[PDB]
Amino acid sequence: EVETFAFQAEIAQLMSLIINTFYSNKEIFLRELISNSSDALDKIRYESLTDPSKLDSGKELHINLIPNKQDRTLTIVDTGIGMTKADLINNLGTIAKSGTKAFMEALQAGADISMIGQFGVGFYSAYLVAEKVTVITKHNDDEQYAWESSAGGSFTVRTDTGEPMGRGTKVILHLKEDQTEYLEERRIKEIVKKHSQFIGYPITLFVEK
Ligand SMILES: O=C1CNC(=S)N1CCc1ccccc1
Structure with a gap:
């Protein structure tokens, strides 16, 4: 049982802008997702200060990066508060x-895509x-859910039947054909050392067979 929804018009406009604008400095996406994961960890950590039973679903607070060349996916896993x-x-x-x-409004003023983080x-x-x-x-x-979109105006939500996670969020990026450099260990390490050296949680790169 799958429910399909339409994006708000402003969001569908931002996604279509991001997929279509020629912009080479694409590596910033990893910084943004790691920072999002760090926020989600901060929130569960804070809530647990007054209610320790919020960690009954998982006490470890960490971020895993899981490239997969066969499926051409890059997964960012965190054990944060979840959604x-x-x-x-x-x-x-x-x-x-x-x-x-x-x-x-900034983009029409000539502003750069790399400033997207300052707007949340x-x-x-x-x-x-x-x-x-x-x-x-x-x-x-709540229960474990799966959200999915290929842009184009719509996304799906469904109950997830896969492996239970306990608590947290798994962002799975199905990479475009010409963006496989983000499945390489030394490229991921270069980005993480550069963009997110100052995150208060362990970031583990999972390296493949
Ligand atoms: O826009 C929506 C509505 N519901 C959810 S979730 N989003 C976030 C989409 C997203 C994109 C890239 C990385 C992570 C999340």
Whole structure:
């Protein structure tokens, strides 16, 4: 059972802009997702200070990067607070609408795509390198869901039947054919050392067979 939804018009405009603008400095997407994961870890960590049972679904707070050359996917896993079904359908886009509009006003003023993080909507930079994004998420107060979009105006939400995660979020980037450099260990390491040396959680690169 799968539900299909339309993006808000401003978000569909930002995604189509990100997929179509010729922009070579695509590596910033990794910085943005790691920073998002760090935020999600901060929130679960803070909540657990007054309620330790919030960590019953997982005490480790970390970020894994999992390239896969065979499936041409790069997965960013974190054990943060995760997202409810209402987050996936409404709440995230509600908070993002203001940063989307402001970010597009800047782009018409000549501003750079790499400044997307300052408006709180850096996750859509995933579409610089991904033709399709799958988000597997589990929040303490909801069931495990799978969000997916290939842009084009619509996304899907469904209950996830795969491996239970406990708590956290899995961002799976189905990379475009010409963006496989982000599946290489030394390229990922160069980006992480450069863009996210100052994250307060362990970042583990999973290297392949
Ligand atoms: O826009 C929505 C509505 N519901 C969810 S989730 N998003 C976030 C899309 C996203 C893109 C890239 C990386 C991570 C997430």
